[PDB]
Amino acid sequence: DLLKAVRLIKFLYQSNPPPNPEGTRQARRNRRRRWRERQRQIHSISERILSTYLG
Amino acid sequence: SDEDLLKAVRLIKFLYQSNPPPNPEGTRQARRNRRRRWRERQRQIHSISERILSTYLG
Known part of the structure; x- marks a missing residue:
């Protein structure tokens, strides 16, 4: 069952929608920064899950 | 090094923050339909988190 991995x-990836364009300069920038680090989390986790299937 | 794990836990x-519990308003039938969708999303997040953490061997 690879399917569990792929759906996860x-x-x-579905769970990190684009950040809010609106608010103060810093609310705008802080949400871009948090979006980019969540995306890094999502990538690293995804890498790790597929690595269990090795390669 | 624990970086990969703390990364997982913050995500x-x-x-979980993206699935807040509902306010119990509207018709009783809407209230129950809405708690039901919430439990299914919450269960989804629960099982996803477990597989993620089990990936770290613990």
Whole structure:
């Protein structure tokens, strides 16, 4: 069952929608920064899950 | 090094934050339909988090 892995990864990517363009300069910038680090989390996790299937 | 794990746990927290419990308003039938969708999303996040953490061997 690879399918569990792929649906999980799919779900992860679905869960980080673009950040809010609106608010103060710093609310705008802080949300971009948090979006980019969540995306790094999502990538690293996804890498790790697929690595269990080795390669 | 624990970086990969703390990374996982912060994302998991975000996942749970994105599924807040509902306010019990509207028709009783809407209230129950809405708690039901919430439990299914919450269960989804729960199982996702577990597989993520089990990936770290613990």
